[PDB]
């Protein structure tokens, strides 16, 4: 219901609805793991060797681990093999002798493959007595008066993605590429950027897996990477180089307003830290990628066909939101998978 001759002060940085959403997604995400199987008994001493490959003496990245495992009955046991990534095994101290990385702190529930990870749009209908306003000014900075508001009973489609370096499938701005901040001359606050034109990314995993069921316990099944038929090929992502150069040209054109028209804007890779804040994290068909993005963020900008490849690394266990004793084991998925996404903005 579009209002008229009305001015309401908006401030996204001191908003409370984003904090309620960050609480609700965590609580609901924990509520979608309790019926699934806890993977306590698999935390056991592994005997691992290299995967069958023409090993070159410069990469691991796959491990062929044999171990004892209980059966349907409690008495018997079975020798069984699986394929784990190198970021999930740690050499505890012939063939070597490993263990899983989560075994030092906490056993972790695996995700039931009936539960999909993909986002569905989440609307926010206001309750009785309250109301939700909406800015509509196309040049809305982020803080201050929006002179064209509109009340609404329930919000638009918000699809919840999880991504770190550059956010995906995010409602894009209309007139031009926009930047947003709280105090631009402050360093601790991030500088959000929302695009006009969605630059496209294609990501894949070429390894043709084979999902294999192992019965840990009666009524509990464990899903292990059984075999790699086809060929061992590293996961990657592709963006168009021309559109990415054009899109960085747009954001450099926008950033020169806040900093002076004669400055040298250059982009660097991440400074360091843990894994999933330097690399680009997302999910793709239910399996979590981590993609190095130094190939996009190196340039310089003075006052006046192909496609960029960038490598990707995969973890099977994940610890998102960094709790004390909760990780999860994302089970491997059958066959080669790929997913296509528009890039809405970057941080």
């Amino acid at each position: 219901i579009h209002l008229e001759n009305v001015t309401e002060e908006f401030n996204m940085w001191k908003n409370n609805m984003v904090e309620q959403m960050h609480t609700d997604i965590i609580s609901l995400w924990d509520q979608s793991l309790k019926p699934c199987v806890k993977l306590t008994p698999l935390c056991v001493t592994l005997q691992c060797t290299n995967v069958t490959n023409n090993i070159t003496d410069m990469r691991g990245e796959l491990k062929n681990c044999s171990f004892n495992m209980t059966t349907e009955l409690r008495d018997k046991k079975q020798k069984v093999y699986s394929l784990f990534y190198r970021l999930d095994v740690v050499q505890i101290n012939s063939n070597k002798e490993y263990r899983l990385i989560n075994c030092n702190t906490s056993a972790c529930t695996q995700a039931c493959p009936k539960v999909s990870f993909e986002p569905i749009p989440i609307h926010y209908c206001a309750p009785a007595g309250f109301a939700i306003l909406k800015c509509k000014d196309k040049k809305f900075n982020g803080t201050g008066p929006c002179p064209s508001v509109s009340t609404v009973q329930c919000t638009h489609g918000i699809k919840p993605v999880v991504s770190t370096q550059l956010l995906l499938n995010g409602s894009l701005a209309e007139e031009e590429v926009m930047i947003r901040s709280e105090n631009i001359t402050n360093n601790a606050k991030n500088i959000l950027v929302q695009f006009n034109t969605p630059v496209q990314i294609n990501c894949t995993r070429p390894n043709n897996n084979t999902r294999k069921s192992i019965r840990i316990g009666p009524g509990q099944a464990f899903y292990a990477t059984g075999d790699i038929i086809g060929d061992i090929r590293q996961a990657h992502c592709n963006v168009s180089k021309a559109t990415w150069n054009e899109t960085l040209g747009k954001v450099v054109k926008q950033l020169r307003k806040h900093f002076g028209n004669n400055t040298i804007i250059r982009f660097a890779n991440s400074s360091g830290g843990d894994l999933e804040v330097t690399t680009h994290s997302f999910n793709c068909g239910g399996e979590f990628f981590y993609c190095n993005t130094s190939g996009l963020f190196n340039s310089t900008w003075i006052s006046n066909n192909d496609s960029i490849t960038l490598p990707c690394r995969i973890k099977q266990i994940i610890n998102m939101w960094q709790r004390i004793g909760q990780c999860m084991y994302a089970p491997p998925i059958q066959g080669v998978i790929r997913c296509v996404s528009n890039i809405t903005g970057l941080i």
Partner: antibody
Amino acid sequence: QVHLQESGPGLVKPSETLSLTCNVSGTLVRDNYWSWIRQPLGKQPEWIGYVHDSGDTNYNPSLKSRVHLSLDKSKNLVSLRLTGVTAADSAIYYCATTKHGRRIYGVVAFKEWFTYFYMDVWGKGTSVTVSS
Amino acid sequence: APTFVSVAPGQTARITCGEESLGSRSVIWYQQRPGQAPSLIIYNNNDRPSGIPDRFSGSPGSTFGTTATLTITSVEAGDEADYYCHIWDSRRPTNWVFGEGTTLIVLS
């Protein structure tokens, strides 16, 4: 059109060194890439090693210990030097050029290719039988 | 150990050689006349050089879990010799020794 031929002793005692030759016809030695092939009777052949120009040379992992090779740069031949002949060396020896190709199967910048060699022509072969 | 395949002169003869495929392969086929050096016939998985006719066929090297096969159509007397396979597997390491040579013989 090429014509290549080796010349060795052909009558070798156990625990003895060994040498061979490679004459040229049609094409000299600095242009192409060279290899060595041996074959015991009633057996599949065995590919000893290959030499490039500018010193790129690789051998068997089994025969890594003892064999050594070189070219004859000014005289336009290829040499050979083997150490410690035993009863497992009686085989007709060959000489061959080789052509190499790439068989790319994936992303090229991630080093997902591999060279593969194939012997386009062949020598005529000399029997080098170990003689106790 | 050299297996024998026998077919009428004019029919097709198939030759299997080597370990079952794991990665992408690059097979090379030879031809050994008795008392001579070999002679190459197929240099890629299916490509053949000049002077060797197109009645030969190789198995394509983009199939996983099969065996490298050489297919001969319209056999003759001059094609009655030994064959050899040499697989370059993109997964298994370098083959420094050829496959087992199946001796090809024609009846009558």
